[PDB]
Design a protein around this ligand. Structure first.
Ligand SMILES: *[C@@H]1O[C@H](CO)[C@@H](O)[C@H](O)[C@H]1NC(C)=O
Ligand SMILES: *[C@@H]1O[C@H](CO)[C@@H](O)[C@H](O)[C@H]1NC(C)=O
Ligand SMILES: *[C@@H]1O[C@H](CO)[C@@H](O)[C@H](O)[C@H]1NC(C)=O
Ligand SMILES: *[C@@H]1O[C@H](CO)[C@@H](O)[C@H](O)[C@H]1NC(C)=O
Ligand SMILES: *[C@@H]1O[C@H](CO)[C@@H](O)[C@H](O)[C@H]1NC(C)=O
Ligand SMILES: *[C@@H]1O[C@H](CO)[C@@H](O)[C@H](O)[C@H]1NC(C)=O
Ligand SMILES: *[C@@H]1O[C@H](CO)[C@@H](O)[C@H](O)[C@H]1NC(C)=O
Ligand SMILES: *[C@@H]1O[C@H](CO)[C@@H](O)[C@H](O)[C@H]1NC(C)=O
Lengths: 346, 224, 366, 50, 198
């Protein structure tokens, strides 16, 4: 591999280098904040409406209670993560009807009134780019009962006792929060994150933001069309970057893919015999007497309980990782959007 | 007669089980056809016994009444009880007794003490038909699919599933296989089977469209 | 569910509702023949172990309770099936094998044994799902001079495959000098007489062994036990017993294009979803009836005892075993108001619930 | 052992997920090293004067 | 000589993979960051590298912390001598005591002892009659050996699952520490931070 290009910078004890112009660049940072919420019925997954399987499962104690408690804690934590990341204002600010901001146009990030959802252009490309699994966050028993085409994976997950809960905050409320934050940071500067929102012209806020990094404010006022054109070109290149490449949102795509694959593996774990004579419980009931089928049922119960505990442990570890990423996203939301940060590469 | 050893070029697979699966990829461990095998293109105008070892099939493109006769068995004529399945247009005469044959077998146009005489459906009718004579657990499951060959040549490229139709169990010892063409030029193929793991591509109708062999190349092992 | 007498404010997932079945239907093929067990168990003279007879039993009603009357054995020893439950389930084909052995080599007829009977005369497979029966026969199978009629093979070149027969009686060659029909040094006859005698010990009496080989159910179901069939029902959560495969579900008309060899239909979880009726050639889809999560939305017991119930993920025109339809199930017992407050008890997609005053009742709001 | 493998195959996919977890950790270690150290675009060389 | 622990670890199926970046590449990246910090200062991490003599860079670093830049040019030799004495003291302290690297030693030792415990767990019977699989294969018939092999398989699967869970938790902790180290690399070396005790 190559570590990089070779550069020999010219150093001397009486030589200085000073820039004579500037460029304005717009980058993109993507952070996952939450994943899908899953609720698991252990009795329908292990037994499947068999009475003596339930009677032999009551002997094993309170494994089902603590696994259900862990999954309920994960489902609460996802909504808590989304709430602490996005909800950071007491008031829903609204942009003025005039769209002049000193030469900078925010028409590609402010919401449009034509669409039923209050999502902007770039948010529309972000939601169209990520291919969701289309799980049971909408009700699907009508589609599962009606036999159309073939058997879906999600219908099998629903029939085996695995249920996906919908999130507390809809996409419209998230878009409303994002639009309020954008309108606040466009009009009022950073003053809306520290109390009452105080209005200011955008060119004068831009002069303050150049003053905060060490450049005098007369540089902006003498060149304001150039900063405006550079900002417009920089925010226009994000459109052409997001309209073609589909590899930018791989973190959110992997967040979807891992929670799909774990449920698929948990469903596929039902087809193994676990050392018994059959993987179907009703064949064991119909084929054997009391004691021998009790032995085979105990083997199947231990195997399915081990599979379910493995799934719960993996979901707990992934929930800890997602919570760490959500805390990082909340810190980046507080310090970059609501103010100006002097931390390098933050 | 003259024998030639050609290649099958990734052709020949059957339905593993007797259940219905729709839109799923399923892996089965069974005596399967090896991809890029070394089949034999036998030629005969006037036939020894092939060393049958845990799997065999059949493929021929001929028509009329010349393509018939699939006599199995360890030894013919007398002595040891062996299977002598004979075939014609409408009858299959299952017998464990041996017909009074000789060193040269022939079917005249113009047996012994038998223990199991069974009469069932006939096993036969540019059409290169394929037939499987797999032996496992003494069952002799037979799979077949009509494959109309477009241009008369060697075994083409395809993954057509051969449907199970025939299940006639003969639980004896069979190591050889002769053939009983009618005697009054034949492009019939002889191949082999082997225990290997597959991964079949189903659909919403229930037809095997694609099949990968998990031991052909390392890319297919990665796919499996 | 919470194992406590007082509950706090919030939403709790308690249990699950499920529509119980009300009818049971049993579908068996229309067969009338009687299986020939008497011609197998009650015979004058059985063949020897090297040449055991094979009898196919099919297309008949099999009654396994008359087996005890035909022969005076002790127990109906089986491996893959319990001896208790033969009659309710049913199979594809039944095979009968019979031979007469000594009393020492009885345990060798079992899956995975090594000896003389198991290695050269009669070998059972790795996964045997049939039954083996043995009983004493000292009164009908012994003479003072000796019973020379039955033979066993003592030497063979290789061990037999499972379910194999070796009838050939050529002179076994253990040396380099050829036999050529002469029985001399290292030219031994394979078959040796048992030599039964009525004054033997307990381990040396002749024992008649009958093997009831069973194969599991497949596309044909020719031999099946005695059970009265029931008329088919559809579009109701019922118990179905299709050829011994018990379960619960709803039978609907199907559009699946089954091939003529196909009989069942399996999903990714390896359970039956499509069955073929043995009487009328048609395919029925099997799906479970209405079920789902049940959540309890309550304030504390210090405040009130009024409870709203959220049936999760159902289009609730089918409630039973105010009503507001939610994207997260539907609410029963909580009215919807045209207001907007802060979220007290979360429910679902932007919908919460709270306990208020303006007659106190539980309301639901965005 | 052939029999041990043939009876281990009856336990389902209790090993593919183990290999997936170990592969994820092995990828994450290299991702950590690349994140910490590879934070420069060009290789800078010090002048010979000290 | 004698059978090593690593040889038994390899023979039992436990394999250690090498990292992607070798130590020479890590040293080259560290040398590049050092040369950029010495010559440019903070401007090599915010665009193009702009040269500056080290006295004026040090004066800018003094102007960052609130002390006026005329106290450097009057006290340059004292500051150079203090920096050289501090570097020599760090060299002497690293040559004297090796107990500062205890966390890196723990990172080595944990994955050493986990693999050692995973090898040592193969000597247990888990309720069977023998810990050796070939003894059970050659001492019993099919059914009883299948029972004991099932017991041994359950025990070994449990031990492997415990090892994988412990490795996942340790990997999460190592990832958190690596993210902290990356933040310290971006904020202390490529710039000047105002955060207290960071
Ligand atoms: C400054 O650098 C030049 C060469 O680059 C060197 O000759 C001179 O000695 C340096 N100044 C001092 C005070 O060392
Ligand atoms: C900002 O962009 C929108 C859409 O690209 C455009 O209609 C508008 O004229 C632009 N405003 C300015 C000041 O360039
Ligand atoms: C089949 O075997 C013959 C034997 O010589 C060989 O020449 C030929 O290449 C083989 N064909 C294959 C491997 O496809
Ligand atoms: C039975 O078949 C096997 C094939 O492995 C063969 O070795 C054996 O000789 C055959 N037995 C007889 C009696 O032909
Ligand atoms: C399945 O069968 C239908 C029958 O009309 C056909 O239209 C469809 O193309 C088939 N799908 C395949 C072969 O993938
Ligand atoms: C056995 O069959 C014979 C002839 O059918 C009969 O006389 C005899 O009573 C039968 N034995 C029993 C025990 O039924
Ligand atoms: C059994 O019933 C089916 C349909 O009712 C019928 O076609 C068939 O002939 C019946 N079997 C007999 C032996 O009559
Ligand atoms: C299912 O729910 C949708 C959403 O409210 C509704 O439009 C539809 O009528 C429902 N289906 C019924 C009640 O059959």
């Amino acid at each position: 591999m190559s570590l990089g290009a070779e550069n020999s910078v010219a150093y001397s004890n009486n030589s200085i280098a000073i820039p004579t112009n500037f460029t304005i660049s717009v980058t993109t940072e993507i952070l996952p904040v939450s994943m899908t919420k899953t609720s698991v019925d252990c009795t329908m997954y292990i037994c499947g409406d068999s009475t003596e399987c339930s009677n032999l499962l009551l002997q094993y104690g309170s494994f089902c209670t603590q696994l259900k408690r862990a999954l309920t804690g994960i489902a609460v934590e996802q909504d808590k993560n989304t709430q602490e990341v996005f909800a950071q204002v007491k008031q829903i600010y609204k942009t003025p009807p005039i769209k002049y901001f000193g030469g900078f146009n925010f028409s590609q990030i402010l919401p449009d009134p034509s669409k039923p959802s209050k999502r902007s252009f770039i948010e529309d490309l972000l939601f169209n780019k990520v291919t969701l699994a289309d799980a049971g966050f909408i009700k699907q028993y009508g589609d599962c009962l009606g036999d159309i085409a073939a058997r879906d994976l999600i219908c099998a997950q629903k029939f085996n006792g695995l249920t996906v809960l919908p999130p507390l905050l809809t996409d419209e409320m998230i878009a409303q929060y994002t639009s309020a934050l954008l309108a606040g940071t466009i009009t009022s500067g950073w003053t809306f994150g520290a109390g009452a929102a105080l209005q200011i012209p955008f060119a004068m806020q831009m002069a303050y933001r150049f003053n905060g990094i060490g450049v005098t404010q007369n540089v902006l006022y003498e060149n304001q069309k150039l900063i405006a054109n550079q900002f417009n070109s920089a925010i226009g290149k994000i459109q052409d970057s997001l309209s073609s490449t589909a590899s930018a949102l791989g973190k959110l795509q992997d967040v979807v893919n891992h929670n799909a694959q774990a449920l698929n593996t948990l469903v596929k774990q039902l087809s193994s015999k676990f050392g018994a004579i059959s993987s179907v419980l009703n064949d064991i009931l119909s084929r054997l007497d009391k004691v021998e089928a009790e032995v085979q049922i105990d083997r199947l119960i231990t195997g399915r309980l081990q599979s379910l505990q493995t799934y719960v442990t993996q979901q707990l570890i992934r929930a800890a990782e997602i919570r760490a990423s959500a805390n990082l996203a909340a810190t980046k939301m507080s310090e970059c959007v609501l103010g100006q940060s002097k931390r390098v590469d933050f | 007669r003259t024998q030639s050893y050609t290649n099958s070029f990734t052709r020949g697979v059957y339905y593993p089980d007797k259940v219905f699966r729709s839109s799923v990829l399923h892996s089965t461990q069974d005596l399967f056809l090896p991809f890029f095998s070394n089949v034999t293109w036998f030629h005969a105008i006037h036939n020894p016994a092939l060393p049958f070892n845990d799997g065999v099939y059949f493929a021929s493109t001929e028509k009329s009444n010349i393509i018939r006769g699939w006599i199995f068995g360890t030894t013919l004529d007398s002595k040891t009880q062996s299977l002598l399945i004979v075939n014609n247009a409408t009858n299959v005469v299952i017998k464990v007794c041996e017909f009074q044959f000789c060193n040269d077998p022939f079917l005249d146009v113009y047996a012994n003490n038998c223990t199991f005489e069974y009469v069932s459906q006939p096993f036969l009718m540019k059409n290169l038909r394929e037939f499987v004579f797999k032996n496992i657990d003494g069952y002799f499951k037979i799979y077949s699919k009509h494959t109309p060959i477009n241009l008369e040549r060697d075994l083409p490229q395809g993954f057509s599933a051969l449907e199970p139709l025939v299940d006639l169990p003969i639980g004896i010892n069979i190591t050889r296989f002769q053939t009983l063409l009618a005697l009054h030029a034949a492009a019939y193929y002889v191949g082999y089977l082997q225990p290997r793991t597959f991964l079949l591509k189903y659909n919403e109708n229930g037809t095997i469209t694609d099949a990968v062999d998990c031991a052909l190349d390392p890319l297919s092992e990665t796919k499996c | 569910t919470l194992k406590s007498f007082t509950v706090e404010k919030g939403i709790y997932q308690t249990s699950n509702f499920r529509v119980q079945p009300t009818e049971s239907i049993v579908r068996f093929p229309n067969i009338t023949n009687l299986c020939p067990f008497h011609e197998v168990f009650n015979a004058t003279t059985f063949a020897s172990v090297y040449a055991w007879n094979r009898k196919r039993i099919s297309n008949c009603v099999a009654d396994y309770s008359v087996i005890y009357n035909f022969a005076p054995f002790f127990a109906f020893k089986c491996y893959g099936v319990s001896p208790t439950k033969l009659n309710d389930l049913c199979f594809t084909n039944v095979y009968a094998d019979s031979f007469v052995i000594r009393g020492n080599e009885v345990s060798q007829i079992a899956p995975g044994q090594t000896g003389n009977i198991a290695d050269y005369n009669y070998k059972l497979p790795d996964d045997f799902t049939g039954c083996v029966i043995a009983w004493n026969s000292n009164k009908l199978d012994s003479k003072p001079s000796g019973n020379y009629n039955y033979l066993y093979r003592l030497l063979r070149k290789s061990k037999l495959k499972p379910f194999e027969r070796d009838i050939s009686t050529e002179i076994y060659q253990a040396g380099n000098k050829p036999c050529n029909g002469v029985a001399g040094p290292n030219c031994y006859s394979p078959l040796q007489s048992y030599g039964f005698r009525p004054t033997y010990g307990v381990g040396h009496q002749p024992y008649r062994v009958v093997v009831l080989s069973f194969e599991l159910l497949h596309a044909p179901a020719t031999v099946c036990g005695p059970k009265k069939s029931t008329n088919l029902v559809k579009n109701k959560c019922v118990n179905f017993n299709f050829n011994g495969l018990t379960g619960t579900g709803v039978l609907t008309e199907s559009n699946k294009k089954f091939l003529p060899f196909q009989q069942f239909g399996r999903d990714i979880a390896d359970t039956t979803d499509a069955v073929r009726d043995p009487q009328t050639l048609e395919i029925l889809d099997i799906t479970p009836c209405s079920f789902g999560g049940v959540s309890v939305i309550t304030p504390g017991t210090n405040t009130s005892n009024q409870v709203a119930v959220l049936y999760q993920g159902v289009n609730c025109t089918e409630v039973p075993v105010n009503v507001f339809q939610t994207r997260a199930g539907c609410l029963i017992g909580a009215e919807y108001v045209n207001n907007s407050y802060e979220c007290d008890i979360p429910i679902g997609a932007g919908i919460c619930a709270s306990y208020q005053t303006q007659s106190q009742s539980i309301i639901a709001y965005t």
